């Protein structure tokens, strides 16, 4: 059973998706991938209408259009230390919830005079109240205790203040979750000094870009942090820090950990808890034993060698 749309994407995306199906076939996972080698191609919206979930690589711009044609307004990134992989900050566990459809990401730019460029940054009560209720629903669904709202409302009094205001309003409906606000630049500095004061963070688009990759590098980097993007009907699974030179360099060198890890999140979403717990734990255990590690984690292993070992452990029965 279970059809899932797969967009392999730009860069090493095709090689991670190859790892995903390889571990999936290994763990004998009941999921058939209906894949489109994109890059209208609104065939994607049709397949998601029937399938309702996707796994995607790295792709207004297409990315921010496809997001908009899917209303993928909420982005979730799980910053969680993996036991075997050691970093300056260990035993960390954060959720970065990010608005995706507004801000500076809609190409609203123009020239008002020669050499004077204006670029618009859009905040609306609609999209902010929505991402704010989503963050608090995430805190309640998952047992998190605090939601910190990150902004720069002291400079952008309107607008960043609109976003702030909706957060405080939404926050009264959830009196069982603690709610704090912090200023983006202060937040970034606390994130390196002491990231353990944070539980769930919620921010608009551009700040979310920054804090996605900053937290990602706290616990291991672009190769191990996974992320989802949700609609109200749709669930798209990707990697957490999806910045421009994230894993694009190299062939057979990339880390499949983040893609596998969110692939196992996708399985949890599909209600396949058995295969989610298996693949996740396989991945996590190959990292802990420290036998094979990819170059970004300090080892010498090829992407194929790392994936091979994940399969050898999903298939093992003495575990």
């Amino acid at each position: 059973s279970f059809p899932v749309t797969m967009l392999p994407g730009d860069g090493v995306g095709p090689e991670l998706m190859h790892a995903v199906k390889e571990v999936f076939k290994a763990a004998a996972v009941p999921v058939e991938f209906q894949e489109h080698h994109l890059s209208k191609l609104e065939q994607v919206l049709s397949s998601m209408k029937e399938n309702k979930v996707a796994i995607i690589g790295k792709i207004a711009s297409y990315d921010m259009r496809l997001r908009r044609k899917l209303d993928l307004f909420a982005n979730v990134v799980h910053v969680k230390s993996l036991p075997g992989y050691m970093t300056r900050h260990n035993n960390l566990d954060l959720v970065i919830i990010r608005e995706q459809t507004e801000g500076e990401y809609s190409s609203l730019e123009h020239e008002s005079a020669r050499g004077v460029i204006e670029c618009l940054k859009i905040v609306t009560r609609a999209k902010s109240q929505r991402i704010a209720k989503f963050a608090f629903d995430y805190a309640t669904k998952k047992g998190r205790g605090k939601v910190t709202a990150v902004h720069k409302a002291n400079i952008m009094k309107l607008g960043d203040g609109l976003f702030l205001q909706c957060c405080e309003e939404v926050a009264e409906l959830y009196p069982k979750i603690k709610f704090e606000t912090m200023i983006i630049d202060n937040c970034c500095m606390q994130l390196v000094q002491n990231p353990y004061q944070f539980d769930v963070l919620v921010m608009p688009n551009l700040y979310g870009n920054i804090i996605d990759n900053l937290a990602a590098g706290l616990v291991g980097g672009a190769g191990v942090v996974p992320g989802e993007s949700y609609s109200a009907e749709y669930a798209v699974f990707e990697t957490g820090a999806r910045h421009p030179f994230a894993q694009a360099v190299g062939r057979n060198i990339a880390n499949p950990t983040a893609m596998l890890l969110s692939a196992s999140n996708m399985l949890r979403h599909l209600n396949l808890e058995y295969h989610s717990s298996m693949i996740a734990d396989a991945v996590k255990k190959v990292i802990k034993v420290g036998k094979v590690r990819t170059s970004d984690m300090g080892g010498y292993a090829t992407c194929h060698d790392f994936t091979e070992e994940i399969c050898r452990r999903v298939k093992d029965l003495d575990e």
Partner: protein, 333 residues
């Protein structure tokens, strides 16, 4: 050769204590500096800072500013906003270097973040289009972008620095950040003695937290500078140990502490002047008193590696004055 007058703004809270501690450390090394205390707290006549404060900073170009208390009034503007527009402070410079006594997870850090201070998302332009729809305007111009990229390659050559990195998000804001990059490259080709490259804000953020050693001088637009500079602060110890200067027009510069006013320890002899000291060291170098600065700097660093006297916030029981006098002792080598 000659004695100079620096406008000194002591500020609030631990302000006067750290100010008066820096005056004492300058005295100790017989540094050619007179001080002229002014007050920058804003008034509004026919919004502005007191006339005596303007005439002071205009006559003697240098200032040294301690922490100001955040105003209470809603309508009261940001004090740094009034300071910036009065003297056209366009380059905010933040050298972030690990301190040898103060152990941090990051040990090899030596970064300078030059930050465009005039425009960007701090344009101050916002509109309510319709109900519940706001619009903040980010502004990038070719003049300002060029000015900052010139400063950064200057700073890089003057302070014998080897690489400059233009940090942008031109992949997203293709026209605004694109223009910024365009002029950075333009300046970079007329100063081919410095290895220049570009990175994305998010690539720098993800790399900074993993390995700060690879970075050097970083030049970027306003918002990106604000975030990145505090981020790099946390790499070395926080706002309490980081210098800061704002270079402006007519030779004007104000060097500042970025840390808090800290009133709970006001009066008690417990504040830390390291931040305000290292900013006044910047001031000395910006004025060309290079040996007085390299000396004062060497003392303060030596005091912190000893450990004998550290304030409450670096792991010591030593008072603000026990710390200060140790430096003054040390600076008479």
């Amino acid at each position: 050769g000659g004695v100079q007058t620096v406008t000194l703004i002591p500020g609030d809270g631990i302000g006067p204590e750290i100010s008066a501690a820096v005056m004492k450390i300058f005295d100790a090394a017989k540094a050619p500096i007179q001080w002229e205390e002014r007050n920058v707290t804003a008034i509004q006549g026919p919004w502005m800072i007191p006339s005596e404060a303007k005439e002071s900073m205009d006559k003697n170009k240098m200032g040294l500013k301690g922490p100001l208390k955040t105003p209470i009034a809603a309508g009261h503007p940001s004090m740094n906003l009034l300071l910036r527009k009065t003297f056209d402070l366009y380059a905010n410079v933040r050298p972030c270097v690990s301190i040898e006594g103060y152990k941090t997870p990051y040990t090899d850090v030596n970064i300078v973040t030059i930050r465009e201070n005039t425009e960007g998302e701090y344009s101050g332009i916002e509109h309510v289009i319709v109900d519940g729809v706001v619009q903040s305007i980010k502004l990038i111009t070719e003049g300002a972008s060029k000015r900052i990229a010139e400063f950064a390659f200057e700073y890089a050559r003057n302070n014998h620095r080897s690489n400059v990195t233009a940090v942008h998000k031109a992949n997203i804001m293709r026209m605004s950040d694109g223009l910024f990059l365009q002029k950075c490259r333009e300046v970079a080709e007329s100063c081919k003695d410095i290895k220049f490259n570009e990175m994305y804000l998010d690539t720098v953020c993800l790399n900074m937290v993993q390995d700060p050693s690879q970075f050097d001088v970083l030049v970027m637009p306003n918002l990106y500078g604000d975030i990145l500079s505090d981020l790099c602060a946390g790499l070395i110890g926080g706002l309490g140990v980081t210098p800061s200067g704002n270079i402006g027009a007519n030779g004007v510069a104000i060097f500042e502490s970025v840390h808090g006013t800290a009133p709970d320890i006001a009066g008690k002899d417990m504040a830390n002047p390291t931040a305000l000291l290292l900013s006044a060291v910047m001031m000395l170098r910006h004025m060309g008193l290079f040996d007085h600065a390299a000396r004062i700097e060497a003392a303060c660093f030596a005091t912190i590696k000893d450990g004998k006297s550290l304030t409450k916030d670096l792991g010591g029981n030593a008072k603000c004055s026990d710390f200060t006098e140790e430096i003054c002792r040390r600076v008479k080598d």
